[PDB]
RNA sequence: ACGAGAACGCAGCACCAGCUGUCCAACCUGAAGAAGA
């Protein structure tokens, strides 16, 4: 319902636990561009999964 | 009828006394009980 999701603090924020997220567990949007991190990270699910 | 006869090279004696197989040294280094859609 509120789903508030603020941002832009300080880098106040640690994702910690179970449930985070597969983007949490992997260092690949953060070194690549939206199209190539976005093919390399369904290239390596679809083997997965 | 032998320069010969008889005669233990034998007796007692601890290879023994003192002395640390000791000194120094992290079983240590890195790792999300975690993710589809």
Same mark, same amino acid.
């Given at each position: 319902?509120?789903?508030?999701?603020? $941002?832009?603090?300080? =880098?106040?924020? *640690?994702? *910690?636990? =179970?449930?985070?997220?597969?983007? $949490?567990?992997?260092?690949?949007?953060?070194?690549? !561009?939206?199209?190539?991190?976005? !093919?390399?990270?369904?290239?390596?699910?679809?083997?997965?999964?």
């Amino acid at each position: 319902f509120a789903l508030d999701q603020p $941002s832009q603090n300080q =880098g106040e924020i *640690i994702y *910690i636990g =179970g449930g985070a997220g597969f983007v $949490s567990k992997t260092l690949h949007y953060k070194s690549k !561009n939206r199209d190539q991190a976005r !093919n390399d990270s369904f290239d390596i699910l679809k083997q997965l999964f």
